[PDB]
């Protein structure tokens, strides 16, 4: 069959994909583009209205001396100009982040012990249901105890709610099912049994605070907001004194002792509280993505859906805005989720591994790393050499480095069943690529690359960590595009090949298996396409409280 990127290349250019020559400078610059044309007109209107010049195509250099390309969102039939994949212009992308930022997981295990042991009252599925009806009134910002409270408008906060899950089926089935994430419904049988065994008789809340609040405030708001309304709901539902010494145990439990944040806080140079992108470890990002529970028979699809999730969040929103800003980093990320290019390379590697070793059956050692990562790296680079249209598409060396190494690293992990040797393969790919083409990425691309081999298996304080536990705050990784989302993919890869239900945290995996989320985490690339087409409906808008 044709290589998977051929259709996209034929869409972009008039020449066949193998053709070496073209003609430039004849397209009218920005005038070739529907989207740039929209922007020019919008800039004129904005400037006229506000009395300050704004977007102007004649500032600086003239875009569009070459073809301004459409991109195929991989696994879809949607082709869009890249501007439609900019996070500012894509409500799906914004909502994906909001849905993560506004979520925390909060145990009821200490709270129920407080109830039974300190209050001396019983906990049953019936009392849990009563508590859940209470907290689903309170959580969006409504009152349960005091007189003369003023409250949030329910329609502005319709996206906020609380569900629970537990590994005990009989207990789960007795709680009102409106409130329950049903593990047996959402996961295939073998994954469900793994997840239920991890959770056991524990009972966990998945709390989502309002998008409008998360946007007004920050990620570190989420666990606090959660805890306030859990606290009020414990008081109301279990008929407690409204503020006694035991009230503080519920607070400490919900805020500290049994809360799981999506992200941990950051050091001062990049100061941020919890639930910001830099704090989200790669294994959590893989577990947030829900491809694993839908596409389990295809480990490539699962791994590359995680890459898409992470490339967007980590490069476009996090590195491209939180840590920089401006035009930003759309195409550093799109390279990893468009034109089916990473898909072509990674299926090649998966098939190579299947045939030679069997998935997860290669020795977990440097011999396998050298074999697989080298073979896959040479395949990917050959494609850029064979197809001039492909090279002109992924025009930045960084983009090519990330894509080729992601395929090499995922493939190596498909072979070993271990993310750490996958990671070693990623760095070997970079070194080979650099020598082959006498170039790699942007000026600063391979800081982590060159530290990379030595720090894969280090055990020292700020060096040694399994890949699943690393994240955007791992020191070498803290600055640069074209790595973080790909590492989340490599983290996913051996687990997808093994058939594991999760990568690093089963609670995080279960917590996003929920169709009441605004973004559909089972189909991240489909959602990015829907947002690009301006067909995604986000939460958090203020239309109800502003003029018509």
């Amino acid at each position: 069959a044709d290589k998977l990127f051929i259709n996209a290349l034929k869409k972009k250019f008039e020449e066949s994909p193998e053709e070496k020559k073209t003609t430039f400078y004849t397209l009218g610059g920005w005038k070739q583009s529907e989207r740039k044309t929209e922007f020019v007109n919008a800039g004129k209107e904005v400037a006229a209205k506000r009395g300050i010049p704004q977007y102007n195509p004649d500032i600086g250099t003239p875009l569009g001396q070459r073809v301004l390309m459409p991109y195929q969102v991989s696994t879809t039939d949607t082709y869009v100009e890249g501007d439609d994949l900019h996070f500012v212009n894509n409500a799906a992308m914004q909502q994906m982040w909001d849905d993560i930022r506004r979520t925390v997981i909060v145990g009821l295990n200490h709270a129920h012990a407080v109830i039974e042991k300190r209050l001396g009252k019983e906990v049953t599925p019936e009392t849990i249901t009563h508590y859940l009806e209470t907290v689903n009134h309170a959580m969006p910002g409504a009152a349960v105890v005091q007189e003369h409270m003023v409250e949030t408008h329910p329609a502005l906060v319709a996206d906020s709610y609380v569900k629970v899950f537990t590994g005990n089926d009989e207990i789960a089935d007795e709680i009102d099912p409106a409130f329950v994430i049903d593990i047996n419904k959402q996961f295939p049988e073998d994954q469900a049994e793994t997840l239920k065994a991890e959770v056991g008789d524990g009972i966990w809340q998945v709390v989502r605070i309002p998008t409008i609040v998360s946007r007004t405030c920050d990620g570190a708001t989420t666990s606090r907001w959660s805890a306030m309304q859990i606290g009020m709901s414990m008081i109301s539902a279990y008929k407690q004194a409204a503020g006694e010494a035991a009230t503080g145990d519920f607070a400490y439990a919900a805020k500290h002792a049994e809360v799981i944040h999506m992200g941990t806080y950051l050091p001062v140079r990049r100061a941020r509280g919890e639930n910001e992108p830099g704090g989200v470890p790669f294994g959590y990002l893989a577990d947030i993505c829900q491809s694993s529970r839908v596409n389990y028979e295809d480990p490539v699809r699962v791994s590359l859906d995680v890459v898409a999730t992470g490339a967007m969040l980590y490069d476009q929103i996090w590195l491209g805005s939180y840590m920089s800003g401006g035009v930003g980093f759309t195409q550093y990320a799109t390279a990893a989720y468009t034109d089916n290019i990473l898909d072509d390379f990674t299926y090649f590697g998966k098939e190579y591994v299947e045939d030679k070793y069997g998935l997860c059956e290669a020795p977990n050692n440097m011999d396998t790393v050298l074999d697989v990562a080298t073979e896959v790296t040479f395949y990917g680079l050959e494609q850029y050499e064979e197809y001039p249209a492909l090279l002109e598409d992924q025009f930045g060396g960084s983009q090519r480095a990330a894509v080729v190494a992601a395929a090499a690293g995922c493939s190596t992990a498909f072979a070993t069943g271990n993310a750490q040797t996958g990671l070693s393969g990623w760095y070997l790919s970079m070194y080979l690529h650099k020598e082959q083409h006498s170039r790699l990425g942007f000026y600063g691309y391979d800081l982590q690359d060159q530290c990379g081999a030595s720090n894969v298996f280090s055990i020292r304080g700020d060096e040694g960590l399994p890949l699943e536990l690393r994240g955007p705050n791992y020191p070498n990784y803290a600055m640069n595009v074209g790595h973080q989302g790909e590492y989340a993919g490599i983290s996913q890869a051996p687990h997808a090949a093994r058939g594991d239900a999760f990568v690093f945290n089963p609670l995080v995996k279960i917590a996003f298996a929920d169709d009441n989320l605004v973004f559909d985490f089972t189909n991240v690339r489909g959602e990015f396409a829907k947002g690009a087409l301006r067909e995604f409906e986000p939460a958090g808008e203020r239309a109800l409280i502003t003029p018509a």
């Binding site: 503020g243 607070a251 271990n418 399994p466 705050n473 089963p506």
Partner: protein
């Protein structure tokens, strides 16, 4: 000596040990036992070998509920604890027979580690203790079992957790009484970020020893912060002596006189009487059926009032055998004593203010918790400059089992290891002995 004051020193049974010791013999800057306690706290680490082994066996590393399927390693760490500990000690020490200690506890399940003091003399701060200990045990475990290059990173994760992706050692299986330097509310706060429950655990719930350890740590931090420099130094030293070291047996005697039937109010009455008898306060003027008291020595009035505050906590929370009301005692001892006398309360209102917020944040939805999870670095309880937290330690020592987040729940690893250290466990003994030893050098 800079100051003229002398104090009589007593033991934790209320028996005289040494008369008329210069106040500065109790100073953190002068007392060799306080130096030894502080350097000990900087250098001591609890290692949970059982915890490391179980984390490895299950691949549960990196924080709560985390697990990496396929990464499991089954190593007989506890069964080889002696060899591992000896190998770690050779890496931790600077020279053979220096003050490095590595002692197994609980049949090899735990280790007490005291990193050599010399490492801290050429360090900026205290993080060498967990970091040197962690890497020595990671390396010793790898070498004991010839763990491969491919797997060794799991040993690292089992020992130190998610660091450096997390700022903290998230999921670690080592523990210290101190916490990381990034978590300081302000520079100089490190000896304040020590959970009350840890102090109570280390001192085995001996009320006077818990109060003493807490006071030593709080007031030593006041020197590091600069609060006990210049004009304020004597105030802080007198507070250390009278509130935390039972100087002149004043705390002890107030508790004795009020323990059978007394209240916070009856302790106040006795303290005001004692202050008058000792010439610390005097009637300044008469209103209608009301005496307005004054003092020519505000620092000494503050210290007497602080001793009464400790005794009131011991009487009130001791009678309940329930710690929660310490927030109330800290508030109303101070509120009451001001309207009883016309003099300012302990720390010129800052204990009362701390107590207002501490009461709120131990009985409300918004944060805090039970008394034992507070500390001098906690945003709720940082405001008084050493005069509040030691009472919280006394109250938790006296709690008979009313707390969910008890020292048994929060501080078990720290109890097992740190209570072994005599100076940590019975600091009142060692600080008084050192003060007596240096009394003619001050």
């Amino acid at each position: 000596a800079k100051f003229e004051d002398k104090v009589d020193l007593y033991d934790d049974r209320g028996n005289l040990v040494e008369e008329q010791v210069p106040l500065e013999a109790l100073s953190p800057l002068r007392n060799p036992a306080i130096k030894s306690i502080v350097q000990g706290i900087k250098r001591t680490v609890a290692v949970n070998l059982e915890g490391i082994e179980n984390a490895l066996k299950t691949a549960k590393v990196g924080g709560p509920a985390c697990k990496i399927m396929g990464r499991e390693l089954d190593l007989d760490i506890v069964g080889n604890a002696e060899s591992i500990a000896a190998a770690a000690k050779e890496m931790i020490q600077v020279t053979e027979d220096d003050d490095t200690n590595v002692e197994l506890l609980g049949g090899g399940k735990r280790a007490l580690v005291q990193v050599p003091s010399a490492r801290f003399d050429v360090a900026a701060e205290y993080s060498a203790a967990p970091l040197v200990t962690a890497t020595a045990f990671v390396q010793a475990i790898i070498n004991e079992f010839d763990v491969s290059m491919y797997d060794a990173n799991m040993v690292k994760a089992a020992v130190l957790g998610r660091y450096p992706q997390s700022v903290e050692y998230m999921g670690a299986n080592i523990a210290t009484m101190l916490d990381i330097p990034q978590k300081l509310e302000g520079p100089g706060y490190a000896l304040r970020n020590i959970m009350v429950n840890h102090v109570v655990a280390a001192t085995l719930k001996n009320t006077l020893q818990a109060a003493a350890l807490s006071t030593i740590l709080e007031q030593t931090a006041m020197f590091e912060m600069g609060d006990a420099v210049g004009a304020f130094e004597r105030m802080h030293l007198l507070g250390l002596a009278y509130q935390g070291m039972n100087a002149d047996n004043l705390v002890f005697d107030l508790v004795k006189a009020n323990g059978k039937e007394g209240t916070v109010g009856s302790v106040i009455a006795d303290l005001v009487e004692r202050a008058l008898e000792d010439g610390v306060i005097k009637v300044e003027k008469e209103l209608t059926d009301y005496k307005v008291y004054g003092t020519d020595d505000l620092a000494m009035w503050n210290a007497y009032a602080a001793a009464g505050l400790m005794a009131a906590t011991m009487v009130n929370q001791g009678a309940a055998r329930a710690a929660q009301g310490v927030s109330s005692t800290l508030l109303y001892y101070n509120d009451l004593i001001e309207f009883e006398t016309g003099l300012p309360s302990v720390d010129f209102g800052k204990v009362e203010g701390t107590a207002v917020g501490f009461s709120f944040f131990s009985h409300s939805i918004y944060g805090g918790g039970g008394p034992g999870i507070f500390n001098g670095n906690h945003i709720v309880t940082r405001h008084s400059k050493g005069f509040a937290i030691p009472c919280v330690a006394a109250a938790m020592a006296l709690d008979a089992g009313t707390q969910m987040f008890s020292p048994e729940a929060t501080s078990g690893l720290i109890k097992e290891v740190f209570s072994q250290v005599d100076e940590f466990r019975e600091p009142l003994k060692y600080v008084v002995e050192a003060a007596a030893e240096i009394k003619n050098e001050i």
